[PDB]
Paper text:
The MavC/substrate complex was generated using the substrate mimic Ube2N-SS-Ub used in NMR studies and in biochemical assays. The substrate complex crystallized in three different space groups, C222, R3, and P65. Indeed, comparison of apo-MavC with substrate-bound complexes reveals that insertion domain undergoes a pronounced 30° rigid-body rotation that would enable MavC to accommodate the Ube2N-SS-Ub substrate. Initial substrate engagement by the enzyme involves recruitment of the E2 component of a conjugate through interactions primarily involving the insertion domain. This is accompanied by rotation of the insertion domain to bring the E2 into an approximate productive arrangement and allowing placement of Ub into its binding pocket, as captured in two of the structures of the substrate complexes (C2221 and R3). A comparison of crystal structures of MavC bound to Ube2N-SS-Ub in the P65 space group (a), in the R3 space group (b), and MavC bound to the product Ub–Ube2N (c) captures the progression of the 310-helix of Ube2N from canonically structured to destabilized to unfolded. In the attacking substrate/MavC complex, the electron density for the 310-helix is lost suggesting this region adopts multiple conformations in the crystal. Here, Met317MavC has shifted ~4.5 Å relative to the E2 into a hydrophobic pocket of the E2 formed by the movement of the 310-helix. In all the substrate-bound structures, the Ub subunit is ready to undergo the first step of the reaction—attack of the Cys74MavC at Gln40Ub.
Residue numbers in the entry:
A (entry chain C): 2 to 88, 95 to 152
B (entry chain A): 9 to 384
C (entry chain E): 1 to 76
């Protein structure tokens, strides 16, 4: 019945002390959903892009992890065609998750356990994969306001 | 020479990956079929169901478990009997500024094995009545607040009394009344003890647990690696070469391919040991996280390895053991592996030999699965 | 009771366990015999991954069962 203390107070600190380089604010209608904007890191294949994500706090949060999805299309080994992200300690929080997603953009080269098709292309034809990520950045993450 | 040892194992792991163990390709395929038979879909085109599992299999890619990589290196540099003797000897905890490891590296060919532990203290609690508490089925590595007792249920399912009075526990139990916080975390930064009796009781319980955990063994091994320290004509150019794989990240082949062994070699012996010692004695997670990344990330991920969800919040402890390496034995083991590969998987270059080994492993896996799940 | 832990390379490891033992306890027994950190181990029984916070009993693992110790992580 209403939001738990944990979400009310964490949302207040998230608005008062945002993650640098990351916009994150709760939805006006359902405060369990957050609209996130992450800038493509400079020097990454995503430079110039801005990437919109939806973050959702399940009823079990923080005993269960937030659910997160790119709403902007992105060519990345950890992100599928649905925008679902591959990457839980209830001692962590939203800002921890956002920091990890930002780091994914800064170092997109795939970790060895990944086996999906984009990870394999990035592993075997890295120069081509990077050019593809830049094209998708220009096509989907720019002129995207 | 010791340097030749280093160049040869690096060259062979780089070229051959998992083939360095000298296991016939058909053994890997057959064992993978044993592991994966339950992965094959039971309905539909079974031949196609089998092909999908074989395609997705990775039995010819190298291990990315750090412990298996270390076993591989020990067996190659020491021989099977020597590695078995090494394993029998005990680990020593790395001292505060690493002096005990420094004084264990005379100017000989030496192999270091490191086991690093993390302090995996409980972060969760829940209330429970004594009549409900079943340690066998209860969530593990967790604090249980009963009406008359406070206990820690460890990762092995053993109950550890935390020495509180019945009166203390009864008050704490009945002070935590919101349904959301019946099962929750300790040390939540968002509670304000001055706002409610529940938040005050949660904070108070957390302080009790923290003091008791100082004297409870919560150590669990998290990483493993080896360091080859070759003989040097002069002690001023004596360098060391860390070798590792890492479960969520990379293989030893990729470590060598990115030259991270050489990059860490540029720190020198004292420079490397000083970073490793600070990792085990620092109480600052921001220091711990950076050094962990610098030393153990795959090449190029040093600045992101331990950020955000992977910040290193827990104390670490570094343990090591050292034994001498006979380069003739090491070189002979590496040459026998090379002879095994050249005899059974001949090819114009390493890439051709690896592909031949892979095709053979896939065919053995396919034949076994089709034999067991179809009739010819 | 005795259970067998088999590896991709054909190694078989015999363990003395109780049905109540946790998956984490099994991985520490594997660490004692093979030197592999429990954090860098995966265990499989009849197609199913064994999760650390669970017990052998949660998977109906009885005497002389065979588990597979997988030492290459893959996921996604």
């Amino acid at each position: 019945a209403g939001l738990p203390r944990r979400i009310i107070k964490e949302t207040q600190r998230l608005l008062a002390e945002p993650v640098p380089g990351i916009k994150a604010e709760p939805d006006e209608s359902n405060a369990r959903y957050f609209h996130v904007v992450i800038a493509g890191p400079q020097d990454s294949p995503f430079e110039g892009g801005t990437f919109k994500l939806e973050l959702f706090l399940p009823e079990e949060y923080p005993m269960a992890a937030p659910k997160v999805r790119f709403m902007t299309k992105i060519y990345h080994p950890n992100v599928d065609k649905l925008g679902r992200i591959c990457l839980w300690s209830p001692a962590l929080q939203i800002r921890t998750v956002l920091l990890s997603i930002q780091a994914l953009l800064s170092a997109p080269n795939p970790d060895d356990p990944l086996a999906n098709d984009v990870a394999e292309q990035w592993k075997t034809n890295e120069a081509q994969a990077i050019e593809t990520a830049r094209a998708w950045t220009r096509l989907y993450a720019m002129n995207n306001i | 020479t010791g340097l030749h040892v280093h160049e040869k194992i690096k060259h062979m792991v780089k070229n051959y990956g998992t083939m360095i163990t000298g296991i016939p390709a058909e053994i890997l395929g057959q064992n993978e079929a044993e592991i994966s038979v339950g992965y094959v879909k039971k309905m539909g085109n079974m031949k196609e169901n089998i092909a999908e599992v074989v395609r997705k299999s990775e039995m010819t890619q190298p291990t990315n478990s750090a412990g298996k990589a270390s076993n591989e290196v020990c067996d190659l540099l020491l021989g099977t009997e020597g590695a078995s003797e090494f394993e029998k000897s005990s680990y020593q905890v790395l001292s505060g500024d690493g002096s005990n490891l420094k004084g264990s590296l005379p100017n000989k060919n030496l192999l270091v094995r490191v086991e690093m532990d993390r302090f995996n203290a409980p972060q969760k609690y829940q209330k429970i009545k004594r009549e409900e508490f079943n340690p066998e089925t209860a969530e593990k590595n967790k604090i249980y607040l009963l009406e008359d007792q406070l206990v820690y249920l460890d990762i092995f399912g053993k109950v550890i009394d935390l020495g509180q009075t019945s009166d203390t526990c009864h008050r704490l139990f009945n002070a935590i009344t919101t349904p959301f916080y019946q099962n929750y975390i300790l040390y939540d930064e968002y509670i304000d003890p001055e706002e409610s009796a529940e938040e005050a009781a949660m904070f108070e319980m957390g302080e009790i647990v923290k003091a008791k955990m100082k004297n409870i063994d919560c150590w669990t091994a998290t990483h493993s690696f080896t360091i080859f320290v070759p003989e040097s004509d002069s002690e001023d150019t004596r360098t060391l070469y860390p070798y590792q794989a890492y479960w969520t990240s990379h293989t030893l082949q990729q470590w060598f391919s990115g030259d991270k062994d050489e990059k860490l070699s540029r720190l020198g012996i004292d420079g490397y040991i000083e970073k490793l010692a600070l990792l085990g004695t620092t109480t600052d997670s921001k220091i711990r996280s950076s050094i962990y990344g610098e030393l153990f990330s795959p090449p190029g991920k040093e600045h992101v390895f331990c950020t955000g969800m992977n910040e290193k919040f827990s104390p670490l402890r570094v343990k090591f053991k050292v034994t001498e390496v006979n380069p003739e034995i090491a070189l002979q083991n590496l040459e026998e592996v090379q002879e095994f590969i050249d005899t059974n998987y001949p090819g114009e270059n390493a890439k051709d030999q690896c592909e031949l080994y892979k095709i053979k492993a896939q065919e053995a896996m396919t034949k076994q699965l089709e034999m067991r799940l179809l009739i010819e | 009771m005795q259970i067998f832990v088999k590896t991709l390379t054909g190694k078989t490891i015999t363990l003395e366990v109780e049905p109540s033992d946790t998956i984490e306890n099994v991985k520490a027994k594997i660490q004692d015999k093979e030197g592999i950190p429990p954090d860098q181990q995966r265990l499989i029984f009849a197609g199913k991954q064994l999760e650390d916070g669970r017990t052998l009993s949660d998977y109906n693992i009885q005497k002389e069962s065979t588990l597979h110790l997988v030492l290459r992580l893959r996921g996604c």
